[PDB]
Amino acid sequence: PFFDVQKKLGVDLDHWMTIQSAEQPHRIPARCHAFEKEWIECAHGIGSIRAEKECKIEFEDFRECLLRQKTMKRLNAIKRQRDKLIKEGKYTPPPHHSGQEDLRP
Amino acid sequence: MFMINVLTLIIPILLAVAFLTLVERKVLGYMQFRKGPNVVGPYGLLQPIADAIKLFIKEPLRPATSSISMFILAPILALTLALTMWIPLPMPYPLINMNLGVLFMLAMSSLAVYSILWSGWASNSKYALIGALRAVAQTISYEVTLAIILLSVLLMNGSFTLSTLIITQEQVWLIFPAWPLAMMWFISTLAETNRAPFDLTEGESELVSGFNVEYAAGPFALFFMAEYANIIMMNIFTTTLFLGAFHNPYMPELYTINFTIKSLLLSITFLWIRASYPRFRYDQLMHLLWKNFLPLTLALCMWHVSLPILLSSIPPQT
Amino acid sequence: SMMRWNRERRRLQIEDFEARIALMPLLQAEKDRRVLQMLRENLEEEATIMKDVPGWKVGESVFHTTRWVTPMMGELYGLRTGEEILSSTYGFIWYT
Amino acid sequence: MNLMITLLTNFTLATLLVTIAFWLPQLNVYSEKTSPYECGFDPMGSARLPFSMKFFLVAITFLLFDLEIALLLPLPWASQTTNLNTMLTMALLLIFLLAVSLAYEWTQKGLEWTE
Amino acid sequence: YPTKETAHWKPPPWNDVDPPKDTLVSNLTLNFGPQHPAAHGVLRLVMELSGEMVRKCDPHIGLLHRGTEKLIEYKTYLQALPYFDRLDYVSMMCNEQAYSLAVEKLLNIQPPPRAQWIRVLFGEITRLLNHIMAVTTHALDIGAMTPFFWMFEEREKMFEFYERVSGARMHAAYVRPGGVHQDLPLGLMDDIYEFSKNFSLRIDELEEMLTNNRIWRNRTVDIGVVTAEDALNYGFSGVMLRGSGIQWDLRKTQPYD
Amino acid sequence: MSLVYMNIMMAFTVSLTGLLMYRSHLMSSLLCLEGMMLSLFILATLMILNSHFTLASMMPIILLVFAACEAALGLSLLVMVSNTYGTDYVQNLNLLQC
Amino acid sequence: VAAFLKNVWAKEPVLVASFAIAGLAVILPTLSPYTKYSLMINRATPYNYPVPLRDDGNMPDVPSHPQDPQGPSLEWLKRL
Amino acid sequence: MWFEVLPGIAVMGVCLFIPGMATARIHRFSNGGREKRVAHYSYQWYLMERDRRVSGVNRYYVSKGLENID
Amino acid sequence: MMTYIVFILSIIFVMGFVGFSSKPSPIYGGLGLIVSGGVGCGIVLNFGGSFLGLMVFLIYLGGMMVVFGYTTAMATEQYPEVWVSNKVVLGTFITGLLMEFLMVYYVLKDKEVEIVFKFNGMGDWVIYDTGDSGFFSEEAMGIAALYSYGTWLVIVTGWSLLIGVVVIMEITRGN
Amino acid sequence: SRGEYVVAKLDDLINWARRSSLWPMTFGLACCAVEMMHMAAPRYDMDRFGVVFRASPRQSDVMIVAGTLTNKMAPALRKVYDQMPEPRYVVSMGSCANGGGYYHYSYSVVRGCDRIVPVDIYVPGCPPTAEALLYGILQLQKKIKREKRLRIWYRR
Numbered sequence A: 001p002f003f004d005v006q007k008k009l010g011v012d013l014d015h016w017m018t019i020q021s022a023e024q025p026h027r028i029p030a031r032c033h034a035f036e037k038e039w040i041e042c043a044h045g046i047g048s049i050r051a052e053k054e055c056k057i058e059f060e061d062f063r064e065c066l067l068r069q070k071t072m073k074r075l076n077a078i079k080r081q082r083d084k085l086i087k088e089g090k091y092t093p094p095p096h097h098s099g100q101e102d103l104r105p
Numbered sequence B: 001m002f003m004i005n006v007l008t009l010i011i012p013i014l015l016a017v018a019f020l021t022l023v024e025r026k027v028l029g030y031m032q033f034r035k036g037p038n039v040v041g042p043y044g045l046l047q048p049i050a051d052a053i054k055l056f057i058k059e060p061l062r063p064a065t066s067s068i069s070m071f072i073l074a075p076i077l078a079l080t081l082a083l084t085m086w087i088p089l090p091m092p093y094p095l096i097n098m099n100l101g102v103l104f105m106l107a108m109s110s111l112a113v114y115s116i117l118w119s120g121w122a123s124n125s126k127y128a129l130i131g132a133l134r135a136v137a138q139t140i141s142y143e144v145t146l147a148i149i150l151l152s153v154l155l156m157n158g159s160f161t162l163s164t165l166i167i168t169q170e171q172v173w174l175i176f177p178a179w180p181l182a183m184m185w186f187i188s189t190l191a192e193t194n195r196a197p198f199d200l201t202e203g204e205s206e207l208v209s210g211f212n213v214e215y216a217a218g219p220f221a222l223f224f225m226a227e228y229a230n231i232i233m234m235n236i237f238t239t240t241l242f243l244g245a246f247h248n249p250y251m252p253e254l255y256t257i258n259f260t261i262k263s264l265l266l267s268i269t270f271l272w273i274r275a276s277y278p279r280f281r282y283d284q285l286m287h288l289l290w291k292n293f294l295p296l297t298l299a300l301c302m303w304h305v306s307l308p309i310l311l312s313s314i315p316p317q318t
Numbered sequence C: 001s002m003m004r005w006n007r008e009r010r011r012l013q014i015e016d017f018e019a020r021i022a023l024m025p026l027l028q029a030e031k032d033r034r035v036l037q038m039l040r041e042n043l044e045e046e047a048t049i050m051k052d053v054p055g056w057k058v059g060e061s062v063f064h065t066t067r068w069v070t071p072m073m074g075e076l077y078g079l080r081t082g083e084e085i086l087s088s089t090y091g092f093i094w095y096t
Numbered sequence D: 001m002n003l004m005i006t007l008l009t010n011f012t013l014a015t016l017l018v019t020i021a022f023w024l025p026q027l028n029v030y031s032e033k034t035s036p037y038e039c040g041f042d043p044m045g046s047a048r049l050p051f052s053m054k055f056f057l058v059a060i061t062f063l064l065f066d067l068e069i070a071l072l073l074p075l076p077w078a079s080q081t082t083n084l085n086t087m088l089t090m091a092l093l094l095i096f097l098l099a100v101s102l103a104y105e106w107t108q109k110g111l112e113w114t115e
Numbered sequence E: 001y002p003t004k005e006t007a008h009w010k011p012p013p014w015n016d017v018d019p020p021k022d023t024l025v026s027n028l029t030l031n032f033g034p035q036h037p038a039a040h041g042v043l044r045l046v047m048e049l050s051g052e053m054v055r056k057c058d059p060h061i062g063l064l065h066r067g068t069e070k071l072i073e074y075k076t077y078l079q080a081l082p083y084f085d086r087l088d089y090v091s092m093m094c095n096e097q098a099y100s101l102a103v104e105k106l107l108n109i110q111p112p113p114r115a116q117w118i119r120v121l122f123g124e125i126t127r128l129l130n131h132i133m134a135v136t137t138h139a140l141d142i143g144a145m146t147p148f149f150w151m152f153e154e155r156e157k158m159f160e161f162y163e164r165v166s167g168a169r170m171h172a173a174y175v176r177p178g179g180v181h182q183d184l185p186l187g188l189m190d191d192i193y194e195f196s197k198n199f200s201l202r203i204d205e206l207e208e209m210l211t212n213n214r215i216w217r218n219r220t221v222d223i224g225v226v227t228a229e230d231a232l233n234y235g236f237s238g239v240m241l242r243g244s245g246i247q248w249d250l251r252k253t254q255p256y257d
Numbered sequence F: 001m002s003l004v005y006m007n008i009m010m011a012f013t014v015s016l017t018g019l020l021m022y023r024s025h026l027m028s029s030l031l032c033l034e035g036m037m038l039s040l041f042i043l044a045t046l047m048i049l050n051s052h053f054t055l056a057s058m059m060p061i062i063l064l065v066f067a068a069c070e071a072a073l074g075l076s077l078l079v080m081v082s083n084t085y086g087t088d089y090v091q092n093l094n095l096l097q098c
Numbered sequence G: 001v002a003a004f005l006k007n008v009w010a011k012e013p014v015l016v017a018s019f020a021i022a023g024l025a026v027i028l029p030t031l032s033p034y035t036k037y038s039l040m041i042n043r044a045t046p047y048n049y050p051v052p053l054r055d056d057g058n059m060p061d062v063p064s065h066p067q068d069p070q071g072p073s074l075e076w077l078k079r080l
Numbered sequence H: 001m002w003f004e005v006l007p008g009i010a011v012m013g014v015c016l017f018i019p020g021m022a023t024a025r026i027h028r029f030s031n032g033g034r035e036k037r038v039a040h041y042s043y044q045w046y047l048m049e050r051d052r053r054v055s056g057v058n059r060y061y062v063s064k065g066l067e068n069i070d
Numbered sequence I: 001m002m003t004y005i006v007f008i009l010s011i012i013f014v015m016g017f018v019g020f021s022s023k024p025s026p027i028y029g030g031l032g033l034i035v036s037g038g039v040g041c042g043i044v045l046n047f048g049g050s051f052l053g054l055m056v057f058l059i060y061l062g063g064m065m066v067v068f069g070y071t072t073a074m075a076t077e078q079y080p081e082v083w084v085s086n087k088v089v090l091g092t093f094i095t096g097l098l099m100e101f102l103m104v105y106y107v108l109k110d111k112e113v114e115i116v117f118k119f120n121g122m123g124d125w126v127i128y129d130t131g132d133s134g135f136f137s138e139e140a141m142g143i144a145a146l147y148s149y150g151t152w153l154v155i156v157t158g159w160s161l162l163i164g165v166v167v168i169m170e171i172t173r174g175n
Numbered sequence J: 001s002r003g004e005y006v007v008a009k010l011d012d013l014i015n016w017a018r019r020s021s022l023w024p025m026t027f028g029l030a031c032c033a034v035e036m037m038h039m040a041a042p043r044y045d046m047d048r049f050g051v052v053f054r055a056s057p058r059q060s061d062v063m064i065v066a067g068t069l070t071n072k073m074a075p076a077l078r079k080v081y082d083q084m085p086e087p088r089y090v091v092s093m094g095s096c097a098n099g100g101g102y103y104h105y106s107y108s109v110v111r112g113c114d115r116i117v118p119v120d121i122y123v124p125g126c127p128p129t130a131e132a133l134l135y136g137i138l139q140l141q142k143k144i145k146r147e148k149r150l151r152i153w154y155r156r
Ligand SMILES: CCCCCCCCCCCCCCCCCC(=O)OC[C@H](COP(=O)([O-])OCC[N+](C)(C)C)OC(=O)CCCCCCCCCCCCCCCCC
Pocket: B180, B182, B183, B184, B185, B186, B187, B197, B238, B242, B273, B288, B291, B292, B293, B296, E214, G011, G012, G014, G016, G017, G020, G021
C-alpha cells in the first residue's frame, strides 16, 4: 500500500531530504555527491533486480566513499608498517613529515 | 598565556562576589533606614574577608542521612557552573569567543539548576526536599520563556554570538525596539537567579533555608558565592543584551568601564527590588510565567520574526 | 534606527562576501597545489615504507573509478605529527 | 582546547575550595550534630517518601513546549533564506500551534494545580 | 482448561472496572517547628502535606507554658500584676489595664479621672506598638522585610515613652489596680504630640509599600476567609471578627475607663 | 567503519538491554528509552555531519522532538499508574493475565 | 464589539495586547511595500561563488567583466 | 550617610574592571599588538591558517606585506 | 592520545549509558543520562554540530529536571539504590564497564575490531573533510532549511506536538 | 621563637574572623525576642557589627536564648544547639534564660538554660534592653578575641 499521492497530486512532500544529490541550501555539496549521482543515474528505471548486479561497481564506489572502509584499512596497513619500521630502526621519517619543511603557500 | 587570562577572569569575579556581599548588606541597610557593616573594616570594606575566612574554619558537618557523593558534588558543580558562564561574555572581548555563546549561556543555566536540585535531594531533609522541588517548579516556569525572549531579541542581532551583539547596538540600544522583551527578560532573570520576589528556594519564612538548610559552612559558601556570581553574570548579560555600549577598537577600556557601571546599576537594581517586595507564592510564580509572560512572549515572537521581514531589516548572520 | 543600521550591516556583509569571492580563485589554486603537494609527499614515502611487503601496489586507488576523489583527512595528514594533525582537523572547532 | 582548560580550572578551584573546607577546621563529630534538621524536634518518617507533585500536567507540557525552542530557534538563520514568505508562514504556523496548544491547556484548566 | 497455574485466575469483572484497592496516600508530615522564623518562637505545627497542599494542621503549644496562673495563686495582687505584662508581651499596658479593671471591679473602687485618661492614652500607644508588630512581622513572614525596619524606629520611640513614664521599655508594671503607679513626668506629653504629629506619614508609607501592591494582594486576598457564623462559633474576637464584617468592638459596645 | 560508531552503537545496545530487562521500576526504564533516543540522535548526527549531507541536519532536531513527544507521553502514562497504585512497580500491572 | 473589547481589556489586558501584537504580525507583512525588499536583499547576498560561464557566443545579457553594465545591479539597495 | 555604600561599590567596580581590560591587553600581547583574530566561520580559519603558513615563523599574527614579494 | 578525543568522550558516553542502563534509581539514572548527554554534546560538537549538540544538551537537561521532579514525586522508595545498594545493579554495572573496557583494549591493540560491523581503531580524525564551509557552518544552514524546504515536516511536527498536549491532557484526567 | 609569633598572629586572624562575622540564629522564645528584634532594629543595628541572622543552625555561630526555656522545648533547644557546628556559642538573654527568672519556682520551666547548653554570656534583665543585649554581644566578641586556640595547640 504505497499510495503514491506525491506523484499523483504532484506535491513534493519529502522527496527533497531523500538523497544527498537533491537541491541543497546554498548549493552545498555532499562529500559523496558524484558517487551517489553516478549510482542513481546508473540504476534509474532498470529495477532493483538488474540494479543489484549491473550497477554494483558504482554502488561499491559510493559505499566506500561513505564509510571509507578500504581507505582506512589501507591507512591501517601504511601506518602499521611505518610503526614497525620505526620500531625496528629500519626507517627514518622525512623532514616534511616532522615539521621543518616551509609549508606551501 | 591563556591560563593567566583564565585566572584574571575568575579570581576578580570572586572578589566582585565578595564585595557584592558588602554592597548587598549596606545598600539593603540604607534602604531599611539602618546602616550596613561599618565596624569590621573602614566603612565595612573588610567585612567580606571576615566572612570568607569564617566559613572555611567552621566545622563542615556532613550529615548522617546525606547521600554524601551528590552532597559534595552539588556545591562543586554550583561554583563550577557559576564561574564558567562568564567565558562567552564580551568584555568587549570574551574569554572564549563562541559562535553560539547565547546557547552556551542558556544550557549552562539549565545545568546550574542541578546544583540546587541535587543539594536538596542529597541532604536527606524535608525542608531541603521542598526547596528542591520548588526549584523544579521555578525552573519549569522560567525556562518556557527564557528561550523565546532571548530568541526574539536576537532576531535583530542575526546570530547567537554575544560579540556581534555589540555591533548590533552600535547606533541605538536594543532596549528601545524591545523594551517589552527587556522588562520581561529582567523578571525572567530575577526568577532564574532565585532572587526576591522570586526567592522560593532559599525561602527564609516558608522553609528554614530550603535546599542548603543542611549545608554548614564551607559547602554553604560555594552556593552563596555561586548565587552572587550568577547575579553579576546575569546583569552583565542583560546589559550586553539591552544596554550595549560604545566600543572603540583602539580603546577597549571605555567599553569596559561603560558596561561595568551599567551592570553595577542593574546589580543595585536587584538589591533594590530585593529590598522592597513581598515574596510570591511559588504557584503564582508559575501562573505568571505561563499565563501572563508566555502569551505575550509568543505574540512578541511573532512580531519579531515578521518585523525584520516587514521592513527589510533582517540582520546579517556574519 | 535598527532598520537603518541592519540595512547598512547587510550592505557591509555583501562587501565582505565580495572581497572573499574576489580572493577565492587564488585560494583555490593554492589549495589545489597544497593537496597535490601533500599527496605526492605521502606517495613518495609510501614506496619506501611499503617495499618489503608482498603483494602491495603503491598508489592503488580504493575506488573503481578514475575520477578525482577529494582527499580525506587521514589521506593527507596520516603520516605526519600530532601537532599538524590536531591543528588541521580540530583547529577551527577548538579555536576560542 | 581552551574550553577544556577553562572548565578544568573552574572545576579544579571549585573542588580545591572544598578539600580545604573539609580538612582545615576542627571536627567534633557525634551522632546528634549530624541528625536531620526538623526545626528542633525529631523528624517523623523519612524525607524519601513520595512528595506528591501538584503541578504535574504543567511538568509534562513543559517537555512539549521545551522542544519548541529546539524548533523556533533557527529563526535568526531561517530569515536568511531566499524563499522567505514560505518561511514566514511556517514560522507563524509554529508559534500559532504553540499558542493554540497553550489556549487549549488553559481552557481545560490544565495550567491550574490540583487539589 | 484449568491447570495448577490457571487455578487462582478469577474471571474478570463485567464492566471491566476493578475496585480501587485504596492504598494509603501517606501525606508527608512536616514538622513546622518552633525554631522557625515564621512560627513565632514557640509553635510546633505538625502538618500533613500533600506535597505542599495542607491537609491537617496540629499546632502543639505549651512550649511556652510557664504555669503563670498557678504562680499567681501564691502571690498577692500587686505581685501578680507583672505576670500580665509577660502574657501578651507586645501589648503590655493593655494586659495591665485588664487585670487592673478586674481587681478594681472586685474591690468596688474606681480610678481617678486623670489615671483613666493616662490608661487610655498608653493603651492606644500600646495598640500602635502591637499593630506595628503585627503588620510588620506578618509582612516579614510573607517577605516584605523592609517596613519592619521602617516601623520599629517608631516602636523604639514609643518604648522610650514607656521608659520615661515608668522606667522600663517593655514591662512597666505601671497601670495598677487603683490607677497608675506614678504621674506623667514633665515634658512627656509634648514629645507624645511630636511623635503623633509624624506617625501618620509612617503609616502612609507602610500602606504605600503594601496595600496597593499586587504581590501583597496575591498573598492575602483569597487567603484565610472566615465566615461570620464560624467566627462567632470559634470564639474569635477583635480583628478576626472585624475582618469578617462583625460590627463588634469592646471600646464601643462594652466601654471601659 | 570509523571508531566512534562502535561505541555509539554500543551505547545503543547497552540502553537497549537496559530497557528490555526491567528492574521492577518504570521510571528507570523510561530513562532507558530516552537514552536510546540519545544514542540514535548522536549516531545519526555523527553520520550526517560526517558525510556533509546538510539538508538532513534538521533531521535529528525533528527526531529529538518526537523523543520527548513520546517521553512526556510515558510520564502521562506513568501518573495514571502511580495514582492507581502507590508505586510505579511494573509487577503491579499483572491484572491482564486472566 | 466595543463592549466585549472593553470587558476583555478590563479583565485581561495582557491577552488583549497579546492578540493585538499577534494580529499585527499576521496581517501587517501582507500590507507592507518592503516585504519584497527583504527577499531581494536575501537573494542578493553572495554566499557562494559566482561560477562563470563558458562563452558559446550568444549570451548578450551576461557580462565578461564585473564592471560591465549588463548583469544584476544593487543600486536599489544603495539608495533604498 | 548613603554615600558610604560608594566605597564598596567602587571596589566591586574595580573587581569588574580587572578581567575584561586584562583580556584586551592579553589579546594585544599574544597577537602582535593588535586584536585577537575572530574565526567564527571556516573561511576565516582558512585565512588565519594561511597567515600562519606564510608568516615563516609559525605565528599567524606576524604579517607579511609587499616587502615579502619582490 | 589527544587525536582520540571523540573516542575518549565516547568512552565516557558508554560509561554513562552503563550507569543508567543498570537502573539504580532514577536520581542516578538521570545523573548518568546527564553525564552521557554532556559528553555526547562534545562528541557531536567536534564534527561541526555546535547548535545540534547544544540543543541535545539543553533539551535533555530540561527533561532530566522534569524526570527528577517525577521520580521524587512518584518513583521514590525509602532507600534509593545508589549503585551498590543492590548486588544486581553493581553486577551489571561492573559487567557493562568491564565489557566496554575489554573492547577498548581489543580495539586499541588490534586497530581493527569486528562486532557485528567492522570498526577501525584509528582515531576518527581521519575521516574529516579537508575543506572549508565558507561563511556558514553547514549544520546551521541545514537546520535553517526546516522553514523554507521543510514545510510538511513543520506541519506534521507541530500537529504532533498539538495533539501530544491534547492526548496528555486526555490521559491525565481520571474521568 | 618564630613559631609562637606565627601561631599568635594566626590566632589573632581566626579570632578576628570569628568575632567579626557572628551569625546568630532566628531563635527567640518570649518577650526577650521582641527586644532582640529591637537590637536588630535600625537604632542599635546588629548588622553593622557583622551580626546577622541565619535561620538554619548549620550556618549559625551563636545561639541567643532569648526568652523562657520551658520543659516542653528543652530537648528542642538541645537539638538545635547540637546542630550548630563548632565553634558555636550561647548568649543567655533575660532572667528566665539565665536562672529561671519570674517563673523560677514553676513546675514547667527549666531553671536557666545552663542546665541544657553551655552558656558563654549571661545578659541580665527582664528584658535587658537592646543596648544591654548588644553590650553582651560585644562582650562575647571580646571573649572570642582573647581565645588562644593555635597557641595552646602549639604548646601541647
Ligand atoms: C532590563 C532593563 C530593565 C527593564 C525594566 C524592568 C525594571 C523594573 C522592575 C520593577 C520591579 C519588578 C519586580 C518583580 C515584579 C513581579 C510582578 C510582575 O511584574 O508581574 C507582571 C504583571 C502581571 O500582572 P497581574 O499579575 O496583575 O495580572 C493579573 C492577571 N489575571 C487577571 C489573570 C489574574 O504584568 C504583566 O504580566 C505584564 C508584562 C509586561 C507587559 C509589556 C507590554 C508592553 C506593551 C505592548 C503593547 C501594548 C498595546 C497593544 C498593541 C498596540 C498596537 C498598536
